[PDB]
Structure 1
Amino acid sequence: MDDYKRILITKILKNEVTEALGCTEVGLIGYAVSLCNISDPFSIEELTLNNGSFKNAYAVGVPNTKKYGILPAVVGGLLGDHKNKLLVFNGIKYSQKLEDFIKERLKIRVINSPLYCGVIKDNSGNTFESLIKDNHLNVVIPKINNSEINGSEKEEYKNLELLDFLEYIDEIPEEIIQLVEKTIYTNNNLIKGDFLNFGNDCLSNMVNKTTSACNTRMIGENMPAMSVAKSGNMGIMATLPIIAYDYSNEQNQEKLIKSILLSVLVTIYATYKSSYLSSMCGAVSKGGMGAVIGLCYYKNGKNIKKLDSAARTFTANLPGIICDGGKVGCALKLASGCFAAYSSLFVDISYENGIVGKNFKECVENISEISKIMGDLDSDIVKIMSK
């Protein structure tokens, strides 16, 4: 209908929906290490990360290494090129000898701060330092210019309503339809085998597929994930429950496309609302709100009261949860999210009950404010993991 709304939503969809090869933090570490440009990787005789980064990278698989941790990311950066940027681990040939070489020399130190990735000395004596700072991945020392969006457009998207999202998925551009199809493609390709299949009912398949794709993204497979806001697990949480619900129901193409589009709209909105960093698991919360709105739209159509009830039951169900770092166990958390979505399709919770919001907007507002309240917990998380 409206013009400014369609163009803003289309632009933000083209912006937020990207492809991230696995965990972004190991990718950033490898990119910084390749920016150090060590000529002979075996000639090395210095990594500084913030609490959240060290947490997320302590037990996550690095692409094309079949290993977990920060040392594989550093070795892959050594064996990578700066021109690949966040895809620094592409085309590499992992050498166990270089891993064993760097293990004795890689001295890592953690700091309490926002995003900070600062790196090495060689046999000759030369020292090469590099730094990547701020929430937006901005290189400060290699100065290699290279996603952002100005605040006015984000603010205009925050001023949208659920009705606007319902109207947008009825007048979808062809580029956005193909984007949704490519998203479903990338995230469905992440399903490899069984990870948590405990039945043949709908929620069984939902949990199975979601946990399998999350585990695939975690174990360091060389398969990209269609991420929203550079959080791949958030995109998995937003898309896969809806995919598996559609698989166990009508097997509808356009219906699933529209439901996932509304899910992504809700996810982008929630991420915009949760403007502050948080140690609360933002991926689970936001992706699950998106997924439950999409599932309610698939079940009841364009029904405002049903979507409000789903958001209320979700807010009452699984609010507040720790983001203890990218891990194989993260899949389990997403599994819980699936539950929180399905349970919200059959339960009504009054607005008075606790932190529950009065509608979709107020639910998202309350969840975002509580995420702001839970605050900086990454310091204590890193202190715990070190033991």
Structure 2
Amino acid sequence: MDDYKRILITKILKNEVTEALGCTEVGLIGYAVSLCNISDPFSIEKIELTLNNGSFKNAYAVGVPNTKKYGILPAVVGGLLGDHKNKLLVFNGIKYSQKLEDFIKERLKIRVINSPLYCGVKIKDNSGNTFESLIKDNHLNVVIPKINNKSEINGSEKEEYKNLELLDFLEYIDEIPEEIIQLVEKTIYTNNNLIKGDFLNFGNDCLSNMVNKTTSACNTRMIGENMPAMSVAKSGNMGIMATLPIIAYDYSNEQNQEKLIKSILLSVLVTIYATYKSSYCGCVSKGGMGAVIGLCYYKNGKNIKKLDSAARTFTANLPGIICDGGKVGCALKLASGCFAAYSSLFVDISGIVGKNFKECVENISEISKIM
């Protein structure tokens, strides 16, 4: 109950657990375009968009909220209508214009580079003036223009979090502040609304519900429904993975909101922890690690001996950072994570895996660095 640690955890929670309208492929392009502040989008003589291949190879199949269209073209058009102050929710409240899409289709040129996250926007208008944007590395790292949005978690606050143990997260889920309780309740509500039908259902059993509900929420997001998702560390998929299996497991079990809240928070805490300790398919390795720990708390309580067994079994049955199948193969990856996390609660491991939760998170983090 360090109180100083409570202050650290709560700042990390408000900085990483945030809303996002649409996938961050289209959300990033829209926000980068929106930062140019083109007063009259019909004045654009030419527009160049510079994206990395890691964000290009998937944006073609992602639907843009409030447009009824899919791909990069409506993400840029949407950006020209949305407000830069909305950040990741740039597509919110936009009134789509087909006349603008027809005008922009002609002047839009896309350059693709092989590098980490990069999203540059260069615009030249009829008057001869030029405009520039640049979001690099992190989904909210705005390089151009200069925006003194001072609070973002600095390196010391991040390093202090990486040094925490599972025992601290187990103590925190008892001493929860009311803002964090409302943030967790918001997360549970936001991602619950994403469930809109059957995507991969094969029964009424607990596992098939987790798979169906997690994949339905995942699909709803990817098709471009005007519904925000509560993302964890800027990843909408990682927030879905960390929450939906626990929401669906609660529904199929006690239906205890008090327990659901603690388990969802524990899961989110573990997810951010793994993300911080990781290097450059982390959705299911980091998100699924939060899910397996969260499900283990609901099913066993604060039994460290059983929480450590769940982490070793999950790490042994690691899905595979493949990712390669665009999106929809993205939902299949979440479904696989659902299976790995649920099955890990019924097997105990006696090599390639660590001894405890902290050792396993570092082993996963090592796999993502070299491979």
Q: TM-score over 0.5 for the alignment?
A: yes
The answer for unaligned runs of 5 or more in structure 1 is 372-382
- Contact (CA 8 Å) 1:33, 1:78: kept in 2 or not? yes
Displacement after TM superposition at 1:370 (Å)? 0.6
Aligned length: 367
Displacement after TM superposition at 1:319 (Å)? 4.4
Displacement after TM superposition at 1:114 (Å)? 2.8
Cα distance 1:78–1:136, how it changes in 2: closer, same or farther (>3 A)? closer
* C-alpha distance in 1 between matches for 2:11 and 2:277: 18
1:261-299 CA distances to partner (integer Å, 9 max, x unpaired)? 1111111111111044xxxx1111111000000111111
Secondary structure in 1 matching 2:248:
helix
* C-alpha distance in 1 between matches for 2:341 and 2:136: 36
Displacement after TM superposition at 1:64 (Å)? 1.1
Cα distance 1:168–1:142, how it changes in 2: closer, same or farther (>3 A)? closer
Secondary structure in 1 matching 2:139:
coil
Cα distance 1:206–1:166, how it changes in 2: closer, same or farther (>3 A)? same
Displacement after TM superposition at 1:56 (Å)? 4.2
Displacement after TM superposition at 1:34 (Å)? 2.6
1:115-156 CA distances to partner (integer Å, 9 max, x unpaired)? 322123334444333323343633333334337211111111
Displacement after TM superposition at 1:224 (Å)? 0.9
Displacement after TM superposition at 1:384 (Å)? 21
- Contact (CA 8 Å) 1:58, 1:325: kept in 2 or not? no
The one of 122, 126, 135 aligned to 2:125: 122
- Contact (CA 8 Å) 1:25, 1:57: kept in 2 or not? yes
What is the CA RMSD across the aligned residues, in angstroms? Answer: 2.7
1:216-250 CA distances to partner (integer Å, 9 max, x unpaired)? 11111111111111111101100110111111111
* C-alpha distance in 1 between matches for 2:163 and 2:255: 34
* C-alpha distance in 2 between matches for 1:332 and 1:19: 23
- Contact (CA 8 Å) 1:59, 1:325: kept in 2 or not? no
- Contact (CA 8 Å) 1:55, 1:324: kept in 2 or not? no
* C-alpha distance in 2 between matches for 1:302 and 1:237: 22
Higher alpha-carbon deviation: 179-188 or 15-24: 15-24
1:324-358 CA distances to partner (integer Å, 9 max, x unpaired)? 486233111101110001110111222xxx52111
Cα distance 1:138–1:251, how it changes in 2: closer, same or farther (>3 A)? closer
* C-alpha distance in 2 between matches for 1:36 and 1:180: 34
Higher alpha-carbon deviation: 359-368 or 139-148: 139-148
The answer for unaligned runs of 5 or more in structure 2 is none
Identity of aligned residues (%): 100
- Contact (CA 8 Å) 1:44, 1:121: kept in 2 or not? yes
* C-alpha distance in 1 between matches for 2:354 and 2:146: 45
- Contact (CA 8 Å) 2:11, 2:153: kept in 1 or not? no
* C-alpha distance in 2 between matches for 1:196 and 1:6: 39
Secondary structure in 1 matching 2:130:
coil
Secondary structure in 2 matching 1:302:
coil
Cα distance 1:176–1:104, how it changes in 2: closer, same or farther (>3 A)? same
* C-alpha distance in 2 between matches for 1:118 and 1:365: 33
* C-alpha distance in 1 between matches for 2:13 and 2:326: 25
Displacement after TM superposition at 1:195 (Å)? 1.2
Secondary structure in 2 matching 1:110:
strand
* C-alpha distance in 2 between matches for 1:288 and 1:384: 20
* C-alpha distance in 2 between matches for 1:246 and 1:130: 44
- Contact (CA 8 Å) 2:21, 2:91: kept in 1 or not? no
The one of 345, 361, 368 aligned to 1:364: 361
1:144-201 CA distances to partner (integer Å, 9 max, x unpaired)? 4337211111111111111111111122222222221111011111111111111100
Cα distance 1:170–1:130, how it changes in 2: closer, same or farther (>3 A)? closer
Secondary structure in 2 matching 1:121:
strand
Secondary structure in 2 matching 1:175:
helix
1:14-63 CA distances to partner (integer Å, 9 max, x unpaired)? 22211112222322211222333334434434100122222342322222
Cα distance 1:248–1:91, how it changes in 2: closer, same or farther (>3 A)? same
- 1:159-308 aligned at under 5 Å gives the runs 159-276=163-280, 281-308=281-308
Question: TM-score, normalization: structure 1?
Answer: 0.88
* C-alpha distance in 2 between matches for 1:170 and 1:329: 37
* C-alpha distance in 2 between matches for 1:232 and 1:325: 18
* C-alpha distance in 2 between matches for 1:151 and 1:75: 35
Higher alpha-carbon deviation: 161-170 or 86-95: 86-95
* C-alpha distance in 2 between matches for 1:216 and 1:160: 35
* C-alpha distance in 2 between matches for 1:370 and 1:225: 28
Cα distance 1:126–1:21, how it changes in 2: closer, same or farther (>3 A)? same
Displacement after TM superposition at 1:83 (Å)? 3.3
* C-alpha distance in 2 between matches for 1:103 and 1:165: 50
* C-alpha distance in 2 between matches for 1:136 and 1:190: 22
* C-alpha distance in 2 between matches for 1:384 and 1:138: 25
Cα distance 1:123–1:22, how it changes in 2: closer, same or farther (>3 A)? same
Cα distance 1:44–1:324, how it changes in 2: closer, same or farther (>3 A)? farther
